[PDB]
């Protein structure tokens, strides 16, 4: 029973590499230009 289930879980793992719906990440509400704006404002503050 253990070996038969080992074969079954090998087939399940073979299925596991193809059923992956890809991670459609949402667009962030902030873009990297504003991130750089935050970086240089914080740099100005810490330099002051």
């Amino acid at each position: 029973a253990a070996l038969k289930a080992g074969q079954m879980q090998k087939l399940r793992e073979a299925e596991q590499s193809s059923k992956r719906k890809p991670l459609i990440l949402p667009a962030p509400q902030v873009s990297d230009s504003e991130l750089d704006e935050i970086v240089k404002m914080g740099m100005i503050g810490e330099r002051a």
């Binding site: 991130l35 970086v39 914080g42 503050g45 810490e46």
Partner: protein, 108 residues
């Protein structure tokens, strides 16, 4: 005479045969740091550094300005710039030095 007329690098006189690298590897005789135990050092360094940032994030309320951008981009290009400056600023300060000398020559 054997231990002063044999270099003891390839012959093992106790077994009346050659040295066994299986028994005695040359990896323990280096005065430097071999390539296997380094990168284990790098993995350990990254590991305890990473637990340091996760505990710093746990103890803090949120992001600081030095944890999302620890250093400004194109920093290594600037590192190359100052390693050229290591002689460029040397003869630049020699330049400003001797122009100080003639400027002091006309002001006197």
């Amino acid at each position: 005479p054997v231990l002063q007329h044999l270099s003891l690098r390839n012959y093992d006189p106790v077994t009346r045969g050659p040295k066994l690298g299986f028994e005695a590897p040359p990896t323990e005789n280096l005065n430097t740091l071999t390539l296997e135990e380094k990168a284990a050092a790098l993995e350990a360094e990254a590991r305890r550094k990473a637990q340091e940032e996760q505990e710093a994030a746990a103890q803090a309320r949120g992001l600081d300005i030095t944890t999302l951008q620890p250093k400004k981009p194109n920093w290594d290009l600037k590192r190359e710039f100052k390693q050229r400056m290591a002689v460029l600023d040397v003869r630049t300060e020699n330049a400003i030095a001797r122009m100080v000398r003639e400027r002091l020559a006309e002001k006197k």
